[PDB]
Design an enzyme around this catalytic site. Structure first.
Site, mmCIF file in Angstrom:
data_model
loop_
_atom_site.group_PDB
_atom_site.id
_atom_site.type_symbol
_atom_site.label_atom_id
_atom_site.label_comp_id
_atom_site.label_asym_id
_atom_site.label_seq_id
_atom_site.Cartn_x
_atom_site.Cartn_y
_atom_site.Cartn_z
ATOM 1 N N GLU A 241 -7.602 -4.377 9.794
ATOM 2 C CA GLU A 241 -6.492 -3.534 10.205
ATOM 3 C C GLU A 241 -6.935 -2.733 11.426
ATOM 4 O OE1 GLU A 241 -5.731 -1.363 6.355
ATOM 5 O OE2 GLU A 241 -3.818 -2.407 6.760
ATOM 6 N N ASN B 37 0.880 -1.160 0.000
ATOM 7 C CA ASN B 37 0.000 0.000 0.000
ATOM 8 C C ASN B 37 0.926 1.222 0.000
ATOM 9 O OD1 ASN B 37 -2.402 1.391 -0.053
ATOM 10 N ND2 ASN B 37 -2.581 1.439 2.205
ATOM 11 N N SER C 164 1.286 -2.379 10.736
ATOM 12 C CA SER C 164 2.688 -2.520 11.150
ATOM 13 C C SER C 164 3.253 -3.903 10.904
ATOM 14 C CB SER C 164 2.891 -2.061 12.619
ATOM 15 O OG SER C 164 2.520 -0.676 12.713
ATOM 16 N N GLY D 168 0.694 2.362 10.796
ATOM 17 C CA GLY D 168 1.761 3.337 10.756
ATOM 18 C C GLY D 168 2.305 3.747 12.095
ATOM 19 N N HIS E 43 -10.510 1.942 3.524
ATOM 20 C CA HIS E 43 -9.292 2.011 4.343
ATOM 21 C C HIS E 43 -9.427 3.047 5.454
ATOM 22 C CE1 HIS E 43 -4.854 2.540 5.023
ATOM 23 N NE2 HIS E 43 -4.895 1.235 4.797
ATOM 24 N N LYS F 100 1.878 4.852 0.146
ATOM 25 C CA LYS F 100 1.217 6.102 0.546
ATOM 26 C C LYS F 100 2.175 7.287 0.527
ATOM 27 C CE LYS F 100 0.057 3.989 4.304
ATOM 28 N NZ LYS F 100 -0.323 3.664 5.690
ATOM 29 N N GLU G 277 -8.428 5.808 7.042
ATOM 30 C CA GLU G 277 -8.705 7.263 7.035
ATOM 31 C C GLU G 277 -9.959 7.606 6.264
ATOM 32 O OE1 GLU G 277 -6.474 5.675 5.085
ATOM 33 O OE2 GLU G 277 -6.955 6.478 3.132
#
Ligand SMILES: [Cl-]
Ligand SMILES: [Cl-]
Ligand SMILES: [Cl-]
Lengths: 241, 241, 241
Positions: free
Chosen positions: A158, A10, A204, A164, A86, A12, A88
């Site tokens: 997740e 992914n 992570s 992150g 996802h 970003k 956010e």
């Protein structure tokens, strides 16, 4: 046995330079087991992965689609995978469980494979609400899918607080979340669908923790952000053997 | 990713001696990627390849069937793959686009996997008519098929002027013809069918030129005449990895 | 060329001890070809194989389901494969062709993959009645199956007199029995079903005789009793390459 695993990057961030070298690394890597590798990115990288990413085990994916026009233009561009729901999108941009579910359904109808994301916040975890929140999320997705559409869906579980942040679930905690989700799918949708469904873990994942996560019975691979910008993503693919 | 590649030999001559030896070479070769290998021949070799060719990646094929009686007897003989519409059937023996299309449809309905051949002559290429000729050929095949039938079709694009002449298309030329065909199938049949369709190149493929041809995004393998009578056919298979 | 082979262990004896070490051996074995490995057992070993057997090419299986309640509880326990019709169920426990057939169909409806066993006795073989007996057995199974059900069925052909006795069929004998069965399925059910059907051999298969048996055209793997309790089962899996 498990269904076919997925190892999904992914992307970003990153520099153009750093990432065509990562594509060249992927192209040159020997992968000797059945795994679907995916590189999800924004428009920044997609013309390049479409053209440059040659490995037979890889596909490209879009990271999001805002409306029907975007879904159709991404498909015509050559993109057949998409990540929806996802982290956010839900908590920073406000997409509800139902908006995510309608996006998943629309993408399936348009011929995408969809990585549909679910997961709880720090407070939902610590207050004991993980099951209610995550099963409510997947229930909304299921309400918009017909039985045959599940062949085109992948779930990515997740924890929001693991994305992150360097906080990864332990193997046992990942297994418990995935077993919960699997049990709900098997009861509500059917044992056939549950056994074919890929439930990926993300939050992570890295090259040192992937193997013991993959060894859990209900983990079918990974959605990987920070470690997918680095050469260790090849070892995360190897961890799905 | 690409659909499963095909490496197809097309045996149009040659000593039974050298061909049992070739079958034994194929049987002993290690192939460690997903590829469907095919050996097409006339009756000269079919009893032998049926009995002797044991490699798990290989199937036998008939090189043509002139009518429904031959289709039925080949199927009962054990043949499940066939080549139809090959070069000379069209231009030497006069099988028109419509005749080839009816043969393809009959074979699909009987349970064959069909390698349906299309391709332009030297004059059609040089006078700028490749696209109109080749898309007219595939449109005629499509007219006699339903969407579901495409799961049993493979297209072999072979410039007539490249077959047996040592004149091979450059990688770029092959890619443009295959991208053209793929675009037509996507627009007129469906993006789903186009993504699953194998489009093979043929016309002077050999062990040295195969890899750079297979690297092209819309090339899914090969139909190989002269080089398939030699040991370098194993390198052509390896080129589809 | 052949459908996917099956290497199935049929555990009828063995210590906790002995058999957990065997699962560990299987887990650490490198299997580099497409094969479905199966470990069939009674309740003695199924919680252990379910949890401990982690190799991606393995599934667990139950040995019998005596009624509808048992089929449902086994499926809910996580068992997705079952062995039905095995020799002693027919000749010692008296299950008729039709009882076996109804159990096969009920297991398929419950979402199992079924290894359905057929085979003749010593006296049936020597009196020339193998074909009438075995084809009557499979015809009874077929009467209770719809065409789509065959994707969930595997046939295990085991001469009763070869099970546990050290008397194995020669490669030629096994090929004639499997070609007889295949010809019946092709003619009565369809060439499509016949080509996809796995027909396994069992009856004193071991690590030394497995390869030449698997080399037969109509043999798709093995159902193995005694030798599956020993490390040579890994060489039986290797024999299916
Ligand atoms: Cl959070
Ligand atoms: Cl020409
Ligand atoms: Cl007996």
């Amino acid at each position: 046995s498990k269904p076919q695993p997925i190892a999904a990057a992914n992307w970003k961030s990153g520099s153009p330079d750093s990432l065509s070298e990562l594509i060249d690394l992927f192209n040159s890597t020997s992968i000797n087991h059945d795994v679907q590798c995916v590189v999800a990115s924004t428009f920044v990288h997609l013309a390049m992965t479409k053209e440059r990413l040659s490995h037979p085990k890889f596909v490209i994916a879009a990271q999001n689609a805002g409306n029907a026009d975007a879904l159709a233009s991404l498909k015509d561009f050559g993109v057949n995978w998409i990540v929806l729901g996802h982290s956010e999108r839900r908590w920073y941009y406000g997409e509800t469980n139902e908006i995510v579910a309608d996006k998943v359904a629309a993408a399936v109808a348009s011929g995408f494979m969809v990585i549909a994301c679910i997961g709880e916040t720090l407070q939902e975890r610590e207050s004991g609400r993980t099951a209610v929140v995550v099963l409510t999320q997947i229930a909304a997705i299921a309400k918009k899918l017909k039985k045959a559409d599940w062949a085109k869906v992948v779930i990515a579980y997740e924890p929001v607080w693991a994305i992150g942040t360097g906080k990864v679930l332990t193997p046992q905690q990942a297994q418990e979340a995935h077993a919960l989700i699997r049990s709900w799918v098997s009861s509500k949708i059917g044992a056939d669908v549950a056994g074919e469904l890929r439930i990926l873990y993300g939050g992570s994942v890295n090259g040192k923790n992937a193997r013991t996560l993959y060894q859990q019975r209900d983990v079918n691979g990974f959605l990987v952000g920070g470690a997918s910008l680095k050469p260790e993503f090849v070892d995360i693919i190897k961890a799905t053997q």
